[PDB]
Structure 1
Amino acid sequence: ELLKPRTLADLIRILHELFAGDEVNVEEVQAVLEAYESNPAEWALYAKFDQYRYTRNLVDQGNGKFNLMILCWGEGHGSSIHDHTDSHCFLKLLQGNLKETLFDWPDKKSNEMIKKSERTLRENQCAYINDSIGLHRVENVSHTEPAVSLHLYSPPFDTCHAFDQRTGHKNKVTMTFHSKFGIRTP
């Protein structure tokens, strides 16, 4: 039974129930994520920006089953083209906008990766991706507005691949938390 999360804290309690079991109901997780109405006061503690690139800020470690984190994208900051390491990956905008570009998995041959499509994710919208859908790049293309997103990955993962748009070649990248539970972890 899916209720509206009243607060970020309420959302987190609800996610612990939804991930109590071995499987994931994606549409339900996505629906509850979308239904949370972003309230900046509730997440200011996690919203720690870096001038030069986007940051990942751990919010909740889950029940063994997922990580919840807040990413803060300065003006012009974006990701690589990457995968999600056999995990569910949910992305909800808490502030500003992000452009999401989708790519197919590259073939063996070295070859420019062409965009499958792109969309603009707006405040409070929740997107979903997994490796079976494809790869994506996420960017704050704004010149004036920082963006903040709320991401849920299950199972948790610490590593992923970045793809060279010109060749399709991939490189394993380890991901680091800029902060955990509101504490800067340098």
Structure 2
Amino acid sequence: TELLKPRTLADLIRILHELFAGDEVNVEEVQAVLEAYESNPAEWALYAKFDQYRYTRNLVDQGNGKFNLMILCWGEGHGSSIHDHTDSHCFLKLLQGNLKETLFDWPDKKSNEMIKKSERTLRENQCAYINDSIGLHRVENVSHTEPAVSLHLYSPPFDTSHAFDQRTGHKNKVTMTFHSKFGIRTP
């Protein structure tokens, strides 16, 4: 229960394994520890593998089955769908650059435009949190000049989730694909 500042990415991962040793999740503690880690680009360069056309997901740690820890690499103008998180916790920490997070409510059955609830700018080293009970979101690198890199933790792990059509609120199931795992490109 005593949270210490992670010295390095490796140290962070060790602390995370401790925090997820059990069956439940202390969200505030996990968020605090992620925020306390000061991004050091040398430590995660191995995972920072970009694609020219869309953002990439790069698996870093499998949390001994309790969580997926991954690094997402967002080119200029790259962004996500409006999506849920499959009944899992989702932590988002910025390692480089800025991302815009837009929040949406769960849609009703009637086909309507999904209206933004709010938006915020996540800045370097900040850590956001979302779950399905909170709502849906879109994450975007709106920069024209700076790539963004973020560190994501999902617990329990999931490899499918839903994308939502902003015009209708209709959803479709999407399978998550990893661009790399443990620094190895996995085509």
The TM-score with structure 2 as length reference comes to: 0.99
What is the DSSP-based 3-state SS (H/G/I as helix, E as strand, rest coil) of the residue aligned with 1:132?
A: coil
**Whole-angstrom CA distance in 2 between matches of 1:142 and 1:81:** 19
What is the DSSP-based 3-state SS (H/G/I as helix, E as strand, rest coil) of the residue aligned with 1:138?
A: strand
**Whole-angstrom CA distance in 1 between matches of 2:17 and 2:105:** 32
Q: Judge conservation of contact 1:19–1:63 (CA < 8 Å) in 2.
A: no
**After TM superposition, which residue ranges in structure 1, 4 or more long, deviate above 6 angstroms?**
none
Paired residues in the alignment total 186
Q: Deviations over 1:34-73 (max 9, x none)?
A: 0000000000000000000000000001121001000000
What is the DSSP-based 3-state SS (H/G/I as helix, E as strand, rest coil) of the residue aligned with 1:173?
A: strand
**Whole-angstrom CA distance in 2 between matches of 1:41 and 1:65:** 26
Runs of 5+ consecutive residues of structure 2 not aligned to the other structure: none
Q: Deviations over 1:151-183 (max 9, x none)?
A: 000000000000000000000000100000000
**Whole-angstrom CA distance in 1 between matches of 2:172 and 2:185:** 27
What is the DSSP-based 3-state SS (H/G/I as helix, E as strand, rest coil) of the residue aligned with 2:42?
A: helix
Percent identity of equivalent pairs: 99
What is the DSSP-based 3-state SS (H/G/I as helix, E as strand, rest coil) of the residue aligned with 1:30?
A: helix
Q: Judge conservation of contact 1:177–1:185 (CA < 8 Å) in 2.
A: yes
Superposition deviation, residue 31 in structure 1: 0.1
Across the aligned residues of Structure 1 and Structure 2, the Cα RMSD in angstroms comes to: 0.2
Superposition deviation, residue 89 in structure 1: 0.2
Corresponding residue of 2:29: 28
What is the DSSP-based 3-state SS (H/G/I as helix, E as strand, rest coil) of the residue aligned with 1:13?
A: helix
**Whole-angstrom CA distance in 1 between matches of 2:151 and 2:90:** 10
Q: Deviations over 1:108-128 (max 9, x none)?
A: 100000000000000000000
What is the DSSP-based 3-state SS (H/G/I as helix, E as strand, rest coil) of the residue aligned with 2:64?
A: coil
What is the DSSP-based 3-state SS (H/G/I as helix, E as strand, rest coil) of the residue aligned with 1:160?
A: strand
What is the DSSP-based 3-state SS (H/G/I as helix, E as strand, rest coil) of the residue aligned with 1:48?
A: coil
What is the DSSP-based 3-state SS (H/G/I as helix, E as strand, rest coil) of the residue aligned with 2:34?
A: helix
Superposition deviation, residue 80 in structure 1: 0.2
Corresponding residue of 1:117: 118
What is the DSSP-based 3-state SS (H/G/I as helix, E as strand, rest coil) of the residue aligned with 2:65?
A: coil
Runs of 5+ consecutive residues of structure 1 not aligned to the other structure: none
**Whole-angstrom CA distance in 2 between matches of 1:125 and 1:182:** 24
What is the DSSP-based 3-state SS (H/G/I as helix, E as strand, rest coil) of the residue aligned with 1:20?
A: coil
The TM-score with structure 1 as length reference comes to: 1.00
What is the DSSP-based 3-state SS (H/G/I as helix, E as strand, rest coil) of the residue aligned with 1:131?
A: coil
